[PDB]
Amino acid sequence: FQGNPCECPRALHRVCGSDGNTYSNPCMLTCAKHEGNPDLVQVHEGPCDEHDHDF
């Protein structure tokens, strides 16, 4: 679980996973998922956080 799931570009296509946890792109989500995150799911695209990942 490395390099098989993740190969996609550094596209800033920010999205959200089920935790509300924003991802840099939905390609890293599915990657992560198939890598070591069987609990992750493509809930839906678009970021859940405002525009950042911190208080």
UniProtKB/Swiss-Prot annotation:
This is Serine protease inhibitor dipetalogastin. Thrombin inhibitor. Prevents blood clotting to allow insect to feed on blood. Also functions as an inhibitor of trypsin and plasmin. Disulfide bonds join 6-31, 8-27, 16-48. It is found in: Secreted. Transmembrane segments: none annotated. The record marks 10-11 as: Reactive bond. It comes from the Eukaryota. Residues 1-50 form the Kazal-like domain. It comes from Dipetalogaster maximus.
